[PDB]
């Protein structure tokens, strides 16, 4: 996630790595897998 | 984690049908007999776990003959034990 | 080769590298070559002009400068030339092109193409846009 | 970071830190400050967090900066996942999802028929609502904020007699209310908003000039599958104290609409003028066929599409019905129960229709095989017009379709002759597309913006049903004739050559493997009066459509430079 | 213990022409209908690989090298029949009359399947349920039928024989047999004839991943009736002695040895 709101660049990395963030459905039900936890 | 190898062996008597074991040379206390006119098929049972397992040894003792000279009628008085290839393991 | 070059931007190219002639025998050192270069618009990194001097000792010429030029010039326009040489191909220009259409002007290129090299070229591929032409013809 | 230690830190420290708790227990001291908490949810929350944001930092000075690019970020990857599950919907069930979806309608409104910057928030919308279509529902009320904009929306047809919130607003709406199907809440003061809705439809296609669009007018029959003023005496008004067996629904046209119709399709009603509401209403009668099981009233259900088969049996002229067409889907599923045993005329009326179409693309065909003058002006009067009759044909072929999946048992059971009919004059495409009529395989407009697509697909389910009333016994002549054929002997020409064959010769193998089952099976006739016509039937037929199956189903590294 | 499939012998293989049966169901268990290459290894459930081409009725699954959605769950009366075309090498299925369309609608997607050495019509039955076959020795019992066949070029399997198909089955009760030389993970060979050891049979395996193994219950091959050094002693006893030797590595623990 990180900066989900900063370089407003439209030609940003933002834009094109916009897929990358779409490469997350290999995890199923999983929205219990862990706690919660940072830093 | 034993580093030596455990030897069994089995005796059986013919006229008899009495059947013993021995461990390492030393008998063990068990012992078994049978009915007259029965068969029997060498066997043994195994979980593996090891690269190598176990190892069918077809040897005889200070007196006693092999199991070579015991199947075959025209073996049956040649003490020189024999592996024919009729002897093959079932799974 | 550099013969891709017109004799206007060689011209311009004379005139940079006089303008800074260091006591009129055409030789340069390392940091000043930086600054010429800069001086009418192109702006890159340091690794290339890091490598020019690999490819040619602290002595730079007017011949090894144009040649470096034209040879990182000459790249961008080869790949820049597949793209506006089809242009007259299609009709708009966008990229679409009836195949019927090329059977009787893609003979008359002036290479003197006859009907069957076009037969093989066009058979071992509807309309086709500019890129699969040039996964097509450069191979 | 923590979170991404290798399996060997987060197994050994863990045990160097879950054990000192465990210390920290012995003698009392305890220091203290698998739910499903759901990352999805918290994901949800995450965007909660955004969604109570959202119109809380932009429409405060949008309906009066970089936080205006995690939208054009978030909205996109929404797309995505929730079209890649797609099963939430199934064990873990929360309501939670359920509020993002209206949490964000509400962020959705504010100019729910214009807005601003991007539309593809309605196609996200679009995404969403496939996941919905006990507690169940709860704190929302979006059906009755639903009869907000719509209510006046009626009155928009008679402010023209809202631009696009009968596009957007009626796109999830449209889409929803057909999407449902599967599960049904109830009906709460939704039929109120209905009615205000259907009977300001069905009255506003009287409004002309400015007719609007026939979309929401098919979104009322989306909608069609709710419940039970035109004439809700104690159903509207007079309902307002606080829903059994009340025997009146959609009565107030039950026999009147029937008598309507049958009165529309007495008349000739060839015209746009014709229908008109019926045209963007009737199709929602249809839809009355659900909650009346099958059709109790099965002769209505045999009558309605007939009546507007004969609709479709007055035939269009030109243009005409160009976008009067796309209501078939709805016709694909009122031959359901379709018990039209019956027939005979209807099925006549399906065969001289298109006995009639294959002599009007017969009369153009020719008007094509036979001018041959040199002249390209023909193109506008032969071909183009071809066209016309073409995209006509695309529309009666996809009604037969669905009528032979089911009229199939009993008819190649028993007998035939009926099904005969149908089969003799199933030489359509045979005679156009089969027939060497580039112009009839000219369908391109039809082909694309209306391979295997109908026309002659249509006869493969038949064609069994054709050979099924041939050789009882003794084909072989066929092949023969499939031979004949195959060397172009006209037509008749070859029968002639045909009625010189011997006889049929069958006396060895197969036989009593095959025609003895024929010879229980047929009893029907046995002469010298089928000869050829019943044997040429499915000759030259099967034999172009062989054809169609058949054979119809350099340069170095530098002068290759060069040519660039 | 599990499944008891059912097949035809295997010198009706057939490699050319137009064939059918259909099959009969009662229950609404779990049926596997199809047809199978005639190197039909038993324990091991069918479809699952290469071996046999099959339909799955329950869930409306079709297995080969793996499931696929194909179809629609049963009902009572379940009358089911296997179409085959050897000549565009191609397999369909039909349900009461009635072709079942692929996912996107095709004709049951089993298509480009080589020869080889035949085909066999098979069948096997889960736990309970009970199945009919109907190899068409006789056509009017052949129900349905006529709608499909006739027009368009089939006859069933058996159309034309005076004594009906015999069949197989698998047993489950085991029987010993010798080793094949291509199992896996098992290895066996003889030692030697040396002086000092006497003759000697051992073993070997795949210690690794991929797999793993049980308990192998093995036995040698032959027997020993019970009867109804000096040079004397020797021959006149009647006594015999074999041996085995555990290796390092192998726990007595879960080794036995003996008769049987």
Not at chain 2, 24 to 39: A, I
Not at chain 4, 301 to 322: H, P, Q, S
Not at chain 4, 350 to 365: D, S
């Amino acid at each position: 996630g990180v900066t989900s709101e900063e370089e407003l660049h439209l030609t940003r990395k933002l834009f094109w790595g916009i897929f990358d963030s779409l490469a997350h459905k290999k995890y199923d039900q999983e929205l219990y897998r862990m706690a919660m936890p940072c830093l | 984690i034993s580093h030596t190898d455990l030897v069994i062996g089995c005796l059986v008597d013919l006229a008899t049908g009495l059947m013993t074991f021995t461990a390492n040379g030393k008998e063990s206390n068990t012992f078994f007999q049978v009915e007259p006119n029965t068969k029997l098929f060498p066997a043994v049972f195994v979980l593996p776990t090891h690269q190598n397992v176990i190892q069918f040894e077809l040897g005889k003792q200070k007196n006693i003959m092999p199991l070579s000279a015991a199947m075959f009628l025209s073996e049956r008085k040649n003490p020189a034990p024999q592996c024919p290839p009729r002897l093959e393991v079932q799974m | 080769m550099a013969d891709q070059l017109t004799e206007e931007q060689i011209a311009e190219f004379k005139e940079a590298f006089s303008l800074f002639d260091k006591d009129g025998d055409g030789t340069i050192t390392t940091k000043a070559l930086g600054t010429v270069m800069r001086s009418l618009g192109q702006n890159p990194t340091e690794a290339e002009l890091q490598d020019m001097i690999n490819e040619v000792n602290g002595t730079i010429d007017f011949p090894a400068f144009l040649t470096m030029m034209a040879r990182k010039m000459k790249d961008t326009d080869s790949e820049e030339e597949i793209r506006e040489a089809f242009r007259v191909f299609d009709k708009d220009g966008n990229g679409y092109i009836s195949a019927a259409a090329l059977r009787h002007v893609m003979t008359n290129l002036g290479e003197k193409l006859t009907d069957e090299e076009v037969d093989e070229m066009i058979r071992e591929a509807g309309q086709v846009n500019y890129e699969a032409f040039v996964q097509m013809m450069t191979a | 970071p923590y979170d991404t230690l290798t399996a060997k830190e987060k197994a050994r420290d863990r045990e160097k830190a879950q054990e000192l708790l465990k210390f920290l227990q012995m003698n009392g001291y305890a220091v203290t400050r698998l739910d499903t908490s759901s990352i999805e949810k918290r994901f949800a929350f995450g965007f909660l967090q955004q969604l109570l944001r959202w119109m809380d930092i932009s429409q405060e000075f949008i309906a009066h900066i970089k936080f205006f690019a995690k939208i054009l970020l978030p909205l996109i990857n929404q797309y995505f996942t929730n079209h890649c599950l797609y099963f939430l919907s199934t064990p873990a069930k929360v309501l939670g999802s359920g509020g993002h979806a209206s949490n964000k309608e509400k962020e959705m409104i504010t100019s729910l028929f214009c807005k601003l910057a991007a539309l593809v928030r309605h196609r996200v919308s679009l995404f969403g609502t496939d996941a919905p279509a006990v507690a169940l529902l709860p704190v929302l009320t979006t059906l009755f904020q639903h009869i907000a904009q719509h209510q006046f929306g009626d009155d928009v047809i008679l402010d023209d007699v809202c631009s696009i919130y009968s596009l957007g607003t009626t796109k999830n709406t449209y889409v929803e209310k057909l999407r449902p199907a599967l599960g049904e809440c109830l009906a709460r003061l939704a039929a109120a908003m209905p009615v205000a809705f259907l009977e300001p439809q069905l009255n506003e296609y009287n409004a002309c000039s400015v007719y609007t669009t026939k979309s929401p007018r098919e979104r009322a029959i989306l909608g069609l599958p709710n419940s039970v003023p035109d004439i809700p005496v104690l159903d509207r008004l007079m309902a307002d104290i606080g829903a059994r067996y009340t025997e009146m629904p959609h009565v107030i046209e039950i026999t009147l609409p029937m008598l309507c119709s049958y009165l529309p399709r007495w008349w000739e009603r060839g015209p746009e003028a014709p229908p008109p509401a019926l045209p963007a209403g009737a199709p929602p009668p249809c839809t009355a066929v659900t909650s009346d099981h099958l059709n109790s009233l099965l002769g209505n259900i045999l009558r309605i599409i007939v009546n507007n088969l004969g609709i479709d049996e007055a035939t269009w002229m030109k243009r005409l019905a160009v976008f009067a067409q796309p209501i078939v889907s709805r016709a694909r599923p009122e031959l359901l129960h379709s018990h039209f045993i019956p027939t005979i005329g209807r099925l006549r009326k399906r065969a001289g229709k298109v006995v009639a179409e294959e002599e009007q693309l017969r009369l153009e065909a020719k008007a094509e095989a036979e001018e041959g003058e040199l002249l390209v002006r023909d193109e506008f009067s032969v071909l183009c017009r071809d066209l016309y009759a073409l995209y006509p044909l695309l529309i009666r072929y996809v009604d037969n379709n669905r009528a032979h999946w089911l009229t199939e048992p009993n008819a190649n059971a028993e007998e035939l002759f009926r099904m005969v009919g149908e089969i003799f004059i199933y030489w359509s495409k045979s005679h156009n597309f089969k027939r060497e009529e580039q112009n009839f395989v000219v369908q391109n407009e039809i082909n694309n913006m209306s391979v295997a697509t109908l026309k002659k697909m249509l006869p493969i389910g038949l064609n069994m049903c054709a050979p099924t009333d041939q050789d009882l016994i003794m084909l072989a002549k066929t092949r023969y004739a499939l031979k004949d054929t195959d060397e172009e002997v006209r037509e008749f020409l070859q029968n002639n050559l045909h009625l010189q064959g011997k006889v049929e010769g069958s006396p060895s193998l197969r036989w009593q493997m095959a025609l003895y089952r024929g010879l229980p099976g047929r009893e029907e006739d046995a002469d010298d009066p089928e000869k050829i016509v019943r044997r040429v039937q499915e000759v030259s037929a099967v034999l172009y459509h062989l054809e169609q199956t058949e054979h119809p189903y350099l340069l170095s590294k530098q002068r290759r430079r060069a040519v660039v | 213990d599990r499944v008891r499939i059912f097949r035809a012998e295997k010198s009706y293989t057939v490699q050319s022409g137009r064939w059918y049966f259909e099959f009969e169901a009662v229950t609404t268990g779990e049926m596997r209908v199809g047809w199978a290459r005639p190197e039909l290894r038993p324990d091991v459930e069918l479809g699952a690989d290469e071996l046999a081409y099959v339909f799955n009725g329950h869930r409306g699954q079709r297995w080969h090298l793996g499931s696929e959605p194909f179809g629609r769950p049963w009902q009572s009366g379940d009358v089911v029949g296997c179409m085959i075309d050897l000549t565009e090498n191609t397999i369909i299925f039909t349900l009461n009359g009635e072709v079942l369309m692929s996912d996107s609608g095709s004709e049951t997607a089993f298509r480009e399947i080589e020869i080889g050495d035949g085909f066999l019509p098979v069948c096997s039955l889960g736990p309970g349920q009970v199945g009919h076959l109907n190899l068409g020795q006789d056509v009017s019992s052949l129900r349905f039928f006529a709608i499909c066949g006739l027009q368009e070029g089939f006859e069933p399997f058996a159309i034309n024989m005076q004594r009906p198909v015999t069949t197989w089955f698998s047993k489950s009760l085991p029987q010993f047999e010798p080793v094949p030389p291509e199992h896996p993970h098992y290895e066996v060979a003889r030692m030697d004839g040396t002086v000092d050891t006497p003759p000697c049979l051992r073993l070997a395996h795949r210690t690794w991943g991929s797999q793993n193994s049980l308990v192998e219950m093995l036995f040698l091959r032959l027997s020993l009736p019970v009867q109804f050094d000096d040079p004397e002693i020797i021959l006149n006893t009647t006594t015999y002695y074999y041996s085995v030797r555990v290796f390092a590595g192998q726990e007595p623990s879960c080794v036995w040895v003996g008769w049987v």
